[PDB]
Amino acid sequence: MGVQVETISPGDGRTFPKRGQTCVVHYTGMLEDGKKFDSSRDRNKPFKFMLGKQEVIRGWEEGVAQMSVGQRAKLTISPDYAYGATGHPGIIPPHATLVFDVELLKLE
Fold this sequence. Notes:
By secondary structure, this protein is mostly beta strands. It has one helix at 58-64; strands spanning 3-9, 22-31, 36-39, 47-50, 72-77, 98-107.
């Protein structure tokens, strides 16, 4: 599987990220058992990335592109769209399905 997008709160339903735009998000990343491994909210600073530059995992590139500005959504990402067989030693185990809570604050 790739990435599944499940809404949490609606956005404007009209403005979706296009290639080359900078997405400003707050996010929380959890393992499939619910353990949080990363969160911009615990740092109290939104996370910015440019769509299409592969600065984020493939599940983020294709999942966040489906969100409208203002939307909060749950992204469930299989390992192929994620850290794969190798994972990230000590943070993300092998073959890990990840769950992200993502809020698209604005586009820059």
